Amino acid sequence: PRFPWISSGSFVEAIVVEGADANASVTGDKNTAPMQLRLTGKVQMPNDEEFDLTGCFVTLEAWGDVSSERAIVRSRSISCKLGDDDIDQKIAGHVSFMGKNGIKGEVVMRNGQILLYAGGAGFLDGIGKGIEKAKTLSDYYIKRAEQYHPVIPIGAGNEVTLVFQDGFQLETLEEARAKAAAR
Amino acid sequence: PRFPWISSGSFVEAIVVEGADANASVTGDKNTAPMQLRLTGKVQMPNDEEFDLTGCFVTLEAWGDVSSERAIVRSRSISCKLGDDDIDQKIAGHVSFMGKNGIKGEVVMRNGQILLYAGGAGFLDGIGKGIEKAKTLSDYYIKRAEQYHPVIPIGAGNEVTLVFQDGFQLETLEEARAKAAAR
Amino acid sequence: PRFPWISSGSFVEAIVVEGADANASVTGDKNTAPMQLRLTGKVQMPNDEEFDLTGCFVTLEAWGDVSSERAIVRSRSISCKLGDDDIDQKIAGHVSFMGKNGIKGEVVMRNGQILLYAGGAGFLDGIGKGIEKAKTLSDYYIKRAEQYHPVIPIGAGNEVTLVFQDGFQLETLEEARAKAAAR
Amino acid sequence: PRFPWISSGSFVEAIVVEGADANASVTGDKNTAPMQLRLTGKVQMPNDEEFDLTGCFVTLEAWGDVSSERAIVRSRSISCKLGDDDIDQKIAGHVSFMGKNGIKGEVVMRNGQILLYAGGAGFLDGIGKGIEKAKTLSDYYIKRAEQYHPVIPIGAGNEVTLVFQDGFQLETLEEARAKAAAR
Amino acid sequence: GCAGVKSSFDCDATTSDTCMTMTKANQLARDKAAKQAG
Amino acid sequence: GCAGVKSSFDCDATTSDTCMTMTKANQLARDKAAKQAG
Amino acid sequence: GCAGVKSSFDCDATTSDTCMTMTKANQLARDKAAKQAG
Amino acid sequence: GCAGVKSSFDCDATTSDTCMTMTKANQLARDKAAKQAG
Amino acid sequence: GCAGVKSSFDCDATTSDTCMTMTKANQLARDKAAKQAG
């Protein structure tokens, strides 16, 4: 089949081509932000052997978590045209940066001006109540500051390593149509 | 079929022709504001190869989010008349600006005068209550200031890059009618 | 068929003939205010080609939104009599002004006198309660000021560009009756 | 079958290749973070005998617990290509570090700035209430600091020993297809 | 107080509200198209 | 007070909001593609 | 006050947020792969 | 106050968090196995 | 205050927490069994 079996746990060095801002909130797993990277190595296989799969696109998804300032990435699919054929398989892999799981960045929040105004209003309200011997503005500003959620920005052009959690057999589009013609 | 297979993850440099103001509120995904851009490059494909698809219109949709001051864009369809034929396919792509996902702008809000008046009324009310040894105006002004929602404006004539999340086979209108005549 | 296929995303420069005041409230999408414009260009098509469709009427609908001071327009139908034939198709397009989506104006509100009176009554009530060592008028004036809703006025004679979101095949009335005679 | 029976309790010295941050919260067992390690010893078997299985990948899962600053690891599968054959079995093992169960690290928390601000706001509120002869900011900051959860970071390149809790018979892919062809 | 994020669109291009009848706009559209075709 | 974690994106690259018509952007796209092809 | 257990990761290796286009990252990936193969 | 029973593990052997890539750990594992076999 | 009935076990014999690897304990068990058989 001119295509080896990509065993479970093989990894390949890559490089990010499309960054994203990781939606890092209590609900980020459902609001994913697509990234993309492109293979620039040789697939390292368990017994010190490889398979030349370079210059190909694999599309991803992203969502960060705040505790560890990392961006968790779940791969989507692959795309390769080595020769006169096409490739489109689904990959259930992930991406690791500098040894650990998920690419890491610096979490970012924007509620500076709104929070400043809300705090100023609250302080003025407290002293105004105290020194007698506004109030309905503060609740509006809180609800306006509560609709953000911290994000982790990931550039485009950093080095990562994709790793295939579950193994699969690489096949081209035509070999996929032919077996689909059987049943 | 004189038309290659646009694999998953190919991207093309484009330029925005119709801007929009991104509805950036807790409910913006359902109130989309159409944009449009027009292809001015060559479709970059995974193995360093291309397909001349330039001078064509792809219609979009937009809605911003406030945390990351970006405008998320979900493509709608394509339109091409290379030769004496037509093209109208549906594209499930998106648009990325300067490396990251979604075009970025500067979020904009308009509640300046209304909020100024509401705050003034509240402050006057507080001091009037305090110094005794209006009130029903403030609630009206809050409800008038609470019907806006911040928007991110996007000009027309900025450079972006469309990217196809899922691959598809480009076909003309006539080839679509003929296969539709089979079933 | 002497009529090309108006592909998805073609646009034509036009000019507004009937303005309107955009109902810009939390419920404006259901209370639309008709406008109308008239084609004064040549339909720009994706591959730098055109189709002379000038001097024709396309009827619209309008409703504004307050955040971005624009008036969103959803087309209704077209009307053309090039020659001895008629044309009446339904167009699902929209209208863009100066690059971005929807024509922009300046939002307008009228609650000046009523709000002035309500505020005066409230202030007088507060001081009258305070200095003892009217009230039932204020609620009436609020309910009278709460039945307006800001509107965006659009003149008649400004330049816009209609754009067809979804493509269609232009056909005359007679060709429509004949195919309707089949089934 | 050229493959011995890996009895219950055999262990092999390994080395971690992909680290992770252990989700150490009251709900971490369901949000696992994948690791990976690679066999660099000989499988020690109960009666002082071995089986050369070196240079192979075994994929894992992780989740820490806070009381004992350890990261509990539950293996997923194995992958070996000794010769012209493949291996992919499921292993129900675990990993022990320096004698005890689970790799140990140093638990890490990030709520420094947010907690500092919340405490400062509370202290200012208390003294402001006290000395009269803000408040609504504090609850927002608590809810922002309550969405983290301590994590235990594990590098990549530390020495561990995998141990198989339940025994199994090692078999290649082809021997698995053939028996699957019987039923 | 004031709003939060910047309260201004950075390219001000509004519409002109002049009171002209339908027929006058129609004649202007004829003039525009006639000039454009030439 | 202020926010928590750093309130700044570390590469500021915003869009330019200039008011040009659809047709002008179209002509600019033609110019760009024509130059790029050469 | 402050947090509890140590509030620091002991190997700081963050990402670089530079604003380069998709095509530029693509050309960099070609350069990297071409060098690596040689 | 403080905790109750002794708050200390009596053999401190933690992990080293050094930032090395997957491939570097792979090469280290090859070096280790090659030395061990000899 | 304190507890009630005597708070002490009258023969203190605890375990030793030394950090040795699995293989080292294995080699110690071989040494022990080999000595015991002789």
Numbering used by the authors:
A (entry chain I), B (entry chain E), C (entry chain A), D (entry chain g): 195 to 327, 359 to 408
E (entry chain B), F (entry chain F), G (entry chain J), H (entry chain h), I (entry chain f): 17 to 54
Sentences from the paper on this structure:
Here, we present the structure of an outer-membrane core complex from the iconic F-T4SS encoded by the E. coli pED208 plasmid solved by single-particle cryo-electron microscopy at 3.3 Å resolution. This 2.1 MDa structure, provides an atomic model of the TraB, TraK and TraV proteins and unveils unique stoichiometry relationships between the three proteins. Surprisingly, the complex is formed by two highly flexible concentric rings made by a total of 69 proteins chains arranged in two distinct symmetries. The components that make up this complex include the proteins TraB, TraK and TraV which are homologous to VirB10, VirB9 and VirB7 respectively and are observed throughout the multi-functional T4SS spectrum.
In the inner ring, seventeen ASUIR heterodimers made of TraBCTD and TraVNTD (labelled −8 to +8 in the clockwise direction) assemble to form the complete OMCCIR. In the ASUIR, an atomic model of the TraB C-terminal domain (CTD) and TraV N-terminal domain (NTD) could be built and refined into the electron density. The ASUIR is predominantly made up of TraBCTD which includes a total of seventeen β strands and three α helices. Six of these strands (β3, β5, β8, β14–β16) mediate the interaction with TraVNTD. The core of the structure has a β barrel that connects to two anti-parallel α helices (α1 and α2) and a third helix (α3) towards the C-terminal end. The N-terminal end of the TraV (residues 17–54) is located entirely in the inner ring which includes a single helix α1. A single ASUIR makes contact with four other neighbouring ASUs, involving two ASUs each in the clockwise and anti-clockwise direction. The ASUs +1 and −1 are contiguous to ASU-0IR and hence bury a much larger surface area of 2481 Å2 and 2435 Å2, respectively. Notably, an inter TraVNTD di-sulphide bond has been observed between residue Cys35 of chain B and Cys27 of chain D. This interchain di-sulphide bond between contiguous TraVNTD chains creates a wide mesh that spreads over the TraB proteins and extends to the periphery of the OMCCIR. The TraB α1 helix and TraV NTD residues Gly17-Ser23 define a rim-ward hydrophobic surface suggesting that this portion of the OMCC is likely embedded in the bacterial OM.
